[PDB]
Design a protein around this ligand. Structure first.
Ligand SMILES: CC(=O)N[C@@H]1[C@@H](O)[C@H](O[C@@H]2O[C@H](CO)[C@@H](O)[C@H](O)[C@H]2NC(C)=O)[C@@H](CO)O[C@H]1O
Length: 199
């Protein structure tokens, strides 16, 4: 519904879910009427079919974070294929959709490896560092002050503070004139290709 070339857009992304906090995170997002992108771990997906179905039905985007969060630069072609495909089949069985984007674990990637990934590689330009400090106030502060039009903000769906940060983060971005979108919406009208990395 929105042209991110026209207006200030941001994509809120969450890695390494789903887990125990995902449904409450989904509650906050719903409450704020805010779509997000979840880069899910293949291995967690199998424990959370309902929750992934919920992501799809409530307008969020699901991307791949590989199966078990391994550094793809150290894997064989076989291992990478497994990382990609097992995660796809997991997501598909659980939610009925296949991911259209992949985020490489630890941001580690390279042309020779990316060639083997059937999706666009999606990185980030804002690292909230929530994985390290687990702190909702600092998560908000970094996201808010570092965000730019077209930014992709990296957060992790692995702890409480992401649930706690969303109301304040969404409120402050909105008030600053930003619209929150999925990665898909963010890249509509821009080139976005398989085996290519974007942040
Ligand atoms: C040297 C380096 O790459 N440092 C940071 C990465 O460790 C970091 O990746 C995140 O590391 C966490 C601890 O192992 C993981 O829990 C987290 O899932 C992993 N991130 C992702 C996207 O897989 C990245 C991203 O935050 O930043 C680097 O600076």
């Amino acid at each position: 519904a929105v042209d991110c070339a026209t207006t200030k857009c941001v994509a809120l992304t969450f890695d390494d879910g789903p887990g125990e906090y995902t449904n409450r995170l989904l509650d906050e997002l719903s409450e704020q009427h805010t779509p997000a992108t979840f880069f899910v771990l293949g291995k967690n997906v199998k424990k959370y079919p309902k929750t992934l179905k919920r992501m799809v039905d409530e307008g969020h985007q699901i991307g791949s974070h590989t199966f078990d969060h391994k550094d793809i630069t150290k894997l064989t072609a076989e291992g990478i294929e497994h990382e990609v495909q097992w995660t796809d089949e997991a997501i598909e069985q659980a939610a009925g959709v296949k991911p259209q984007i992949l985020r490489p674990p630890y941001g580690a990637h390279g042309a020779v490896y990316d060639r083997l990934i059937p999706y666009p590689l999606v990185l980030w330009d804002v690292d909230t560092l929530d994985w390290k400090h687990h702190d909702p106030q600092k998560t908000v502060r970094i996201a808010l002050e570092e965000a730019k039009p077209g930014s992709i903000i990296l957060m992790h769906d692995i702890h409480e503070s992401s649930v706690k940060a969303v109301p304040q983060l969404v409120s402050k971005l909105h008030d600053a004139g930003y619209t929150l979108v999925t990665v898909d919406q963010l890249f509509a009208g821009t080139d976005f290709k398989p085996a290519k990395a974007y942040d």
